[PDB]
Amino acid sequence: TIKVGINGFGRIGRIVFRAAQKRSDIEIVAINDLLDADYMAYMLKYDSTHGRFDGTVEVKDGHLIVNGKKIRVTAERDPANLKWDEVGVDVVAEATGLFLTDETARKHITAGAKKVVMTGPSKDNTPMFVKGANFDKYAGQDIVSNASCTTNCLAPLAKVINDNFGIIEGLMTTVHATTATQKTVDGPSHKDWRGGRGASQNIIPSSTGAAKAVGKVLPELNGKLTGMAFRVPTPNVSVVDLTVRLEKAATYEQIKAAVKAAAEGEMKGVLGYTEDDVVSTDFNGEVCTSVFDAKAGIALNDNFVKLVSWYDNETGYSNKVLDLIAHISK
Amino acid sequence: TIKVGINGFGRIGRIVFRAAQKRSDIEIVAINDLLDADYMAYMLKYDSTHGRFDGTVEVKDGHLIVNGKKIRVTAERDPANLKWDEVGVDVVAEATGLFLTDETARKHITAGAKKVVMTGPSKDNTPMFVKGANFDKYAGQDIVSNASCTTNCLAPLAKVINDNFGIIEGLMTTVHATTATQKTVDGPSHKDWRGGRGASQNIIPSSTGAAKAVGKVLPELNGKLTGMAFRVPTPNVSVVDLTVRLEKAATYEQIKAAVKAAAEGEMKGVLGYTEDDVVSTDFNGEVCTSVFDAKAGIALNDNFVKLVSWYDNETGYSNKVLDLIAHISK
Amino acid sequence: TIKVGINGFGRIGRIVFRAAQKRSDIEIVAINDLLDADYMAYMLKYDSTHGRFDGTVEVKDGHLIVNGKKIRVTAERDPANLKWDEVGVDVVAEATGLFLTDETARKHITAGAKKVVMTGPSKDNTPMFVKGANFDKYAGQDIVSNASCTTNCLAPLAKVINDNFGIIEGLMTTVHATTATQKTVDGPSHKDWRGGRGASQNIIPSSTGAAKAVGKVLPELNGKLTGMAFRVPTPNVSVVDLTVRLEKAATYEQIKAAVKAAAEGEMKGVLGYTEDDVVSTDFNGEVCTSVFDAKAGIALNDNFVKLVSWYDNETGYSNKVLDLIAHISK
Amino acid sequence: TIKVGINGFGRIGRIVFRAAQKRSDIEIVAINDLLDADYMAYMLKYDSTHGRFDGTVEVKDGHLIVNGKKIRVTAERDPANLKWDEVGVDVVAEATGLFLTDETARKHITAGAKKVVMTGPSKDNTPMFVKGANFDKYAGQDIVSNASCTTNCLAPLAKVINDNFGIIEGLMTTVHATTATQKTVDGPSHKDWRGGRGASQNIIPSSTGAAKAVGKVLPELNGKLTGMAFRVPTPNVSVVDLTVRLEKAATYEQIKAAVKAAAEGEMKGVLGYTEDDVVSTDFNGEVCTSVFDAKAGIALNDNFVKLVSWYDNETGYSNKVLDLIAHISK
Numbered sequence A, B, C, D: 001t002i003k004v005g006i007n008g009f010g011r012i013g014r015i016v017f018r019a020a021q022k023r024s025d026i027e028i029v030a031i032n033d034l035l036d037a038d039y040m041a042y043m044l045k046y047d048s049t050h051g052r053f054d055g056t057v058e059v060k061d062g063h064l065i066v067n068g069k070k071i072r073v074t075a076e077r078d079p080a081n082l083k084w085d086e087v088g089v090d091v092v093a094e095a096t097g098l099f100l101t102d103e104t105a106r107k108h109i110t111a112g113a114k115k116v117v118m119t120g121p122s123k124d125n126t127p128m129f130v131k132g133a134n135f136d137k138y139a140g141q142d143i144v145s146n147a148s149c150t151t152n153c154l155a156p157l158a159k160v161i162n163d164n165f166g167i168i169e170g171l172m173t174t175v176h177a178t179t180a181t182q183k184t185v186d187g188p189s190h191k192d193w194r195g196g197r198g199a200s201q202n203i204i205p206s207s208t209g210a211a212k213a214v215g216k217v218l219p220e221l222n223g224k225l226t227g228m229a230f231r232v233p234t235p236n237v238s239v240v241d242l243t244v245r246l247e248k249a250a251t252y253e254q255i256k257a258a259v260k261a262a263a264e265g266e267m268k269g270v271l272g273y274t275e276d277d278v279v280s281t282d283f284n285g286e287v288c289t290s291v292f293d294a295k296a297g298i299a300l301n302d303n304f305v306k307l308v309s310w311y312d313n314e315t316g317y318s319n320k321v322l323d324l325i326a327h328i329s330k
């Protein structure tokens, strides 16, 4: 069993926590945030998106007892003082959004943890991994990043399309659920003016490096992909809309067959495949990081196609954070 | 003054009515729908999207008095019985969605009107005209179609891009506001299963012929564009996301300059241009049918680019219905 | 096992179906609606509010196979032709909204069923039963009504409050989720003008007979309660806000104790009790028809108090439809 | 002309600014916030709720030029250093939410301003005023409060009902639009746990002292009113739902006549009256602080009634902030 400490009990920290409950190989043993234990219990117990917690939650002497297991609660803002070794933490899920460089995340190792997984793209050269794309490149590094939710959706699909047909170039849009960085009514967002506008009222364009970042996890695609996002008023689940030019001519039935074969074979549990008349809520709670929507896509011709793939930006990414923790512990 | 009769007082009929109040050349003299006059007055007076009617509305003897002018109200299910000649109607804005062929719309001419403008794409070979694409091709037809709200956004932008740089092949997506065909909660939609899913909860993939329809108004683009839609939980305003491969190399700054020149020149009032940090609500009430969003788009390279253009799917289209009524009346 | 036929596969029919899967005493053996079996299977499999169906669904020879059991599918518009006897149906869940009188619902009995439960308030004097109010008054009737979702929330709470403290007079408000009768954007609703206004954009006042209907199930409260509704932009879960004047003085802590005792005692599984910091989504999927929110209510004084109670208007009501089917089948 | 400085360019500061443009008696001459001038120009120019600014906005040398008038922009967090006398400020609209006591707001006077109006209820004994209730009690104080949006809706209506019929006791609910203190998805709100839950997904109960505060502006009602709130997923406009017991029996027609007479007489421009089939968006942009909805209310009997009154929580309150500035300057 790998013992995990969570730093940051936001959306990702809390959904990582829930996902860990259903996995025998990983045990959460500690959570650090600036929240009292009783408030943390409340945030875990009730979830507007994913419903009530499946289990028991007790607060006792400032710590959490979840399904009978003691969880150490701390409130340190300097990771160096977290004493992770005192709870035997193997890997830290670094989920605050604040320690996305080697120098900041290394404090967890100073504090006693063996390894760190950043639940977001690194701001320095800390290596990023995406399951289905490059987990097999992991080379023992003590600090790694799971990239972003959007890159976790695009890269598996781009890998299948490229391996089979050769991507000449592609442009991506993600139509993305509202997230915690947005505002309920027009409010201050000085580093992202569009992102301050009322989330429930608007389609909001947003820049994203997620498509370009596919080149870090699939170097053969470096320079061949970029894109952008529209934030829309849904609370969870997002969709990738990938427009690509192909070297090898492929009918839409041939593209479907290639994606389905990968979903049922090497990318099982990462890439999914459906031909049903799905909508976004049909993926609320989905663990696959990329579910190809066969009927939604459209080809102009055998070398120019628009492909659609769903992702639960909360659940799929959180599950693959856990997958990366397990992988680096092998 | 062109005297206009409106058949159908749905979203388009009512926003056409409001827009006509601000035009000196066009006067609404009659409305036909299966609604009592007092209910018609209520729907005109109050609008959840566009606010209160700017003017006075009263009911007198079963007809409407709007800004002191009498509007004849009827409830005929057969357009042949509309007696448009009794109110001197020149052009009918045919806005029921039910009479999109020559044989059905021509009943208005039997009923006394001189010309008909369909407020939707024709279902036979009734010619479509889109301002900024092919109004200059109009050659005296007495029944025409103003195409669709999406075709009105894509066509003007595609023409500028094709005329300057040559579109080899393009794929659209329209991220589109919720419309009246959708359902509040998951409900029956036997001919469009995804479309019956609750509109406020979901991102809903939808098919659209708008991109392919650009070939009807711009024959040079026939076979070069196709696309799809995502319906999202906003009440009005939509956006075109056009991914094109270009024959002539063009940097993103050169593309911006070409679009801005058309917006400030020949296409003024049809194609708009902005470099501001806009979001969808910034176009609620916008009259331009295609507003290019300079900062939102992104180029992968000089021959492969993603272009973004906004449209108020209610207001822009309705204003151009009136423009086509004026154009065919010259 | 009670064999049940469902007439009407709308929101209530489909959530009754799901809830029946978890009950050993009731088995759905047939569904009737104007939908093809493959579309029925789609609506059952995917739900924007309640997630994916927990089980298997397939179509075989025009009928449904759900969890390996065959469900007879028909599309009869006249219930007299439903041949319920051919599938051994004991009770019909009459869920179309169209047959809310004895003469119409009794066609099911001519068609071979033994008893009928209307999933809405009867429009004649067909008796209504509400769990926690008057199930014990049932005296062998073969056609009954389960009242409405709001009456199911208010009645159990009103009974506890009246029995303990005496309600002299009370006024409700239900802040209610959007329903299928509403419109996505401002549209025609000739018999309820406010109800045609776009559901996602507005707080919509609505009339309701639910408070007055409590007198039918609790004759002692006849003439003592009335109220109204506000429809708001949420997809499911509603709340009762009951303002009552009391005959016997009761502090808010004494009121809480009385409600908690009923929730933990005689009214267990019908009336719930919480002191947590809950919000509407915390009751999405809740089976209790009335969950008292201790912290949300407020007393002005010992004889004048505002009480708050939650209900999943889909799930709670549907589960109590099944409870009434079981109760009349004893 | 009264020269005004705005401290805090949030929703209230910006809508006060817009409202001031349409009033000759008040001139905004300076704005202080922690935002650059170019970002302030953007927030003023575009508004998701109220549309584009009606006028011209230029940034020049770090200050704003709005409709040709120079507006001094500063970014001081210590009001004592604002040098309001250097721009000749008469009254400060204190709109940060941070200086709601005499000691903090007095810094504006230290800094050169003559008077301060707090755009929120005071936290100390700073006197509150509500137009239509107690402006005539203002006695020259240099620091005052305009109370809250909800008290500005309830107090005018409560005054008419009490003056005519005698309020024995009342309980209020406000069904309230989402505001800036809420969260887009479940997030941290340690002082208001329910208020951190995703705003677009939930009906959210909230405590409010607004009803009790009516007793400060109408002492004759002290101890006779209290209530609570439900926050719901709309972006603006809220509604008061007042359940009251009356000393003098009054038919609902008599209540309507009393409210209408006050709306057309002494409370003109504060209290409005409608019998139309309105919904919340019909009051987006409304300047009256309380619009009585005659058809929405319901009486149980001649002494126990539920009354409904609308308010644009942004626009009405902002206009009455300006009214209070003008009043204290008389």
Ligand SMILES: OC[C@H]1O[C@H](O[C@H]2O[C@H](CO)[C@@H](O)[C@H](O)[C@H]2O)[C@H](O)[C@@H](O)[C@@H]1O
Pocket: A190, A191, A192, A193, A194, A195, A207, B277
């Ligand atoms: O931070 C100052 C800049 O604000 C805007 O730019 C930011 O926000 C944009 C979205 O509205 C992003 O696209 C951009 O990356 C951010 O820098 C504004 O557009 C700029 O003019 C300001 O310099």
Ligand SMILES: OC[C@H]1O[C@H](O[C@H]2O[C@H](CO)[C@@H](O)[C@H](O)[C@H]2O)[C@H](O)[C@@H](O)[C@@H]1O
Pocket: A277, B190, B191, B192, B193, B194, B195, B207
């Ligand atoms: O009408 C029966 C068919 O329903 C679906 O197809 C419709 O709905 C789709 C959106 O869900 C549209 O894309 C499609 O064009 C419609 O025909 C279902 O997908 C089909 O299998 C049914 O035969």
Ligand SMILES: OC[C@H]1O[C@H](O[C@H]2O[C@H](CO)[C@@H](O)[C@H](O)[C@H]2O)[C@H](O)[C@@H](O)[C@@H]1O
Pocket: C190, C191, C192, C193, C194, C195, C207, D277
């Ligand atoms: O059907 C005609 C009437 O429409 C309205 O009244 C209906 O709609 C209201 C909600 O907007 C309901 O309260 C009312 O009970 C319905 O009858 C309108 O208010 C009436 O004046 C019309 O006659």
Ligand SMILES: OC[C@H]1O[C@H](O[C@H]2O[C@H](CO)[C@@H](O)[C@H](O)[C@H]2O)[C@H](O)[C@@H](O)[C@@H]1O
Pocket: C277, D190, D191, D192, D193, D194, D195, D207
């Ligand atoms: O701040 C700690 C308390 O948090 C909650 O109470 C706050 O938030 C409530 C709404 O969820 C408010 O009603 C209350 O006024 C606030 O104090 C929690 O309910 C309490 O148990 C905590 O002590």
Ligand SMILES: O=P(O)(O)OC[C@H](O)CO
Pocket: B130, B131, B132, B133, B134, B135, B136, B137, B266, B267
């Ligand atoms: O591009 P067209 O043919 O619609 O022409 C519209 C121009 O405004 C003509 O002046």
Ligand SMILES: O=P(O)(O)OC[C@H](O)CO
Pocket: C130, C131, C132, C133, C134, C135, C136, C137, C266, C267
């Ligand atoms: O209050 P009633 O009559 O519905 O009784 C329901 C109780 O659960 C009976 O045991």
Ligand code: NA
Pocket: A020, A021, A022, A023, A024, A025, A026, A027, A028
């Ligand atoms: Na585990």
Ligand code: NA
Pocket: B020, B021, B022, B023, B024, B025, B026, B027, B028
């Ligand atoms: Na006109």
Ligand code: NA
Pocket: C020, C021, C022, C023, C024, C025, C026, C027, C028
């Ligand atoms: Na069963």
Ligand code: NA
Pocket: D020, D021, D022, D023, D024, D025, D026, D027, D028
């Ligand atoms: Na002014």
